[PDB]
């Protein structure tokens, strides 16, 4: 049972009725447009209607690096290098102008966010736009890529070495000495792993959502 992230509502004082109405519209749109299951690190090809062009669609292929948003306003970003230029495009799942969504390669990566791939070598981020879909097994877990990317010189967009980021796909040893890691570890905040004030329980909510989604089908 794969429950898509957008269906899970975020905690707050907003009325649950909005989510129920939003989910109904989302489920209705899902019938019009099929949203395939995918995870961060999967390479996807998405078909969208071109506003600048007249009656011509657009297909962009890239590795999924981030999933954000909830409800009808949920969006996903996939990254690729085109003509040697790294490009990231954010696609809204329920936008009427997205004609079709294709999961060219369904797979998972070590980390839930792949923004560090910008600091990684280009080859880890380069993907052929015309690559054909690879075989996948529906009744199985998505393949998990455990390859550790190599970083570029120390100046990075973010301090991935810090424990808070907790990136498990970076070859820190090659670019960072153990002493440097210890300096990064000074921001460990060990109580955070044990802090119950930052934990949000959605087990009951997730279970309830599953039947509602299936019932609409």
């Amino acid at each position: 049972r794969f429950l898509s992230p957008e269906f899970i509502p975020p905690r707050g004082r907003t009325n649950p009725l909005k989510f129920k109405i939003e989910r109904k519209d989302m489920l209705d749109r899902r019938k019009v447009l099929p949203i395939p299951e995918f995870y961060v690190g999967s390479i996807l090809r998405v078909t969208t209607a071109d506003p600048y062009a007249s009656g011509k669609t657009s297909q962009f292929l890239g590795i999924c690096i981030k999933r954000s948003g909830n409800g009808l306003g949920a969006t996903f970003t996939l990254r690729n290098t085109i003509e040697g230029q790294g490009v990231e495009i954010c696609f809204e799942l329920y936008n009427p102008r997205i004609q079709e969504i294709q999961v060219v390669k369904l797979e998972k990566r070590l980390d839930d966010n792949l923004l560090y791939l910008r600091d990684a070598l280009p080859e880890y981020s380069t993907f052929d736009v015309n690559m054909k879909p690879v075989p996948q097994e529906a009744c199985q877990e998505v393949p998990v890529n455990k390859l550790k990317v190599k970083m570029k010189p120390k100046p990075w967009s973010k301090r991935w070495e810090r424990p808070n980021f907790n990136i498990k796909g970076i070859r820190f040893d090659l670019a960072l000495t153990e002493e440097q890691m210890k300096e990064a570890q000074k921001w460990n905040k060990p109580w955070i792993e044990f802090d119950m004030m930052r934990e949000y329980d959605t087990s009951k909510i997730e279970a309830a959502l599953w039947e509602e989604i299936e019932a609409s089908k």
Binding site: D25, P96, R97
Partner: protein, 95 residues
């Protein structure tokens, strides 16, 4: 307006020229363009636009009010504006 404490706020303010996109009859929910001052779950006052352009818009609307008691013609549960793209409609292609 939301109160910001000693530094403010907690004063009545009005936003003008907000269009209505859709109304839900079952839950009596009105969809209004733009943002509304105040916090969530806060009561607000709704009244017809007073701008000169929309001087007489009630001529084609229920003049005193809408009476469900009359039930001359049962209204749809969800009311949509013509430009609004309803959910479950075909994907929009910019042809």
């Amino acid at each position: 307006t939301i109160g910001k404490g000693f530094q403010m706020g907690n004063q009545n303010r009005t936003v003008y020229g907000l269009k209505v996109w859709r109304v839900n009859t079952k839950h009596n929910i009105i969809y209004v363009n733009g943002s509304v001052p105040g916090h969530k779950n806060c009561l607000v006052k709704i009244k017809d636009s007073t701008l000169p352009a929309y001087k007489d818009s009630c001529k084609n609307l229920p003049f005193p009010t809408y009476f469900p008691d009359g039930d001359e013609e049962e209204l749809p549960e969800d009311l949509f504006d013509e430009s609004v793209w309803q959910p479950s409609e075909p994907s929009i292609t910019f042809a």
